[PDB]
Amino acid sequence: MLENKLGIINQLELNRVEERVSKENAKRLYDSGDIDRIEVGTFKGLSYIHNYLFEDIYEFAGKVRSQNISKGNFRFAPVMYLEIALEHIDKMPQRNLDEIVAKYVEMNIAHPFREGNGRATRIWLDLILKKELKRVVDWNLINKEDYLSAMERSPVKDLEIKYLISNALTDKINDREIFMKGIDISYYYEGYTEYNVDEL
Numbered sequence: 001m002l003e004n005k006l007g008i009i010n011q012l013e014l015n016r017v018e019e020r021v022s023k024e025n026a027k028r029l030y031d032s033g034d035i036d037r038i039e040v041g042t043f044k045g046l047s048y049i050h051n052y053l054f055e056d057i058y059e060f061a062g063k064v065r066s067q068n069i070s071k072g073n074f075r076f077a078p079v080m081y082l083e084i085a086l087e088h089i090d091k092m093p094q095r096n097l098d099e100i101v102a103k104y105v106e107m108n109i110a111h112p113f114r115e116g117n118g119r120a121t122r123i124w125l126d127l128i129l130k131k132e133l134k135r136v137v138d139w140n141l142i143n144k145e146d147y148l149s150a151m152e153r154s155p156v157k158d159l160e161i162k163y164l165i166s167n168a169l170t171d172k173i174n175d176r177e178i179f180m181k182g183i184d185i186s187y188y189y190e191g192y193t194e195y196n197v198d199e200l
Contacts, residue, residue: 002115004057019192022053022116024200026123026183029053030176041094041103041128043086043112050113050120060114069111074155076111085110094128101162103128105154122186130173138178139185141168147189 001011008014029035029052039045051062064086068079077085089110092103104125111117126136142164150160172178183197 003059005059006057015192016194018054018057019187019194020200021056022119023183023187023195023197025053025056027180027197027200029123030179035123035127038127040131041124042090044090045127046107046112046120046124049123050116053120054116058114058116061116062113064112065114067114069114073152074109077109082110082112086112094132097133097162097166100125100128100132101158101165105158105161108151109155118190119186122182126182129169133169134173135169135171136173136175136178137165137168137182138170138172139168139182142185144185144189 001009002014004014006014006017008017029049034052038048047062054061064082066079069076085106089103089106092106093099094103104121107121107124108117113120122137122139129135129137146164147161150164153159154161170178180197187193
C-alpha cells in the first residue's frame, strides 16, 4: 500500500479518490489559465504539473523520488544519477517532432516521481508541441494498446511512438474539448476510468 494525505486504507478507494481529485485539479489547471503560465519543456514545469494534480493526495507531489522503481520491461533512471539525468533532459533540444519525441522518451525513462509520471508527462508533452510546432495531440486518435506498446518499445526505437504522435497532431491548440478528452484518455491509459473530467 502507498502513503497518502487522506488517511485512506483501501487501494481501490485510494484509486477512486485520486482520480476524482487530480482530475478536478487538471480541469482547474486549464480553466484558470495556469497551464499557460508554466515553464515549457523543463523538469521545473513537469514538477509544477505533477504537484498541481497530486498535492492534495500525496506528500511527494512535484518531488523527485528518493528510491528506485521497477515496472514494465525496461528500467527507469536509477536514483544514483536521476538528478543529473533531469539536468540533461532540460538541455535537450525541442525544435522539431524528432527532438520533441526524443526528449519525451528520455523523460519517460527518467520517471522522476513515485507515481503519476505518465499523466503529468503527457500534459508536459502537449505544451512543448503547442509552443514549438503549434500542435497538440488529439489523444482520441491514439489507441490505448498501440500507445502502451509504442512506449515500451521507445527506449530501443522511438519510431512507433513518433508515428502515433505525428498522426494524432491537430492545430486546434486552444480547443478545451481536445484537452478535457485527452485527460480522460491519459487516465484510461493508466486504468483510471471511474470519472469524466467534464462532469467534475
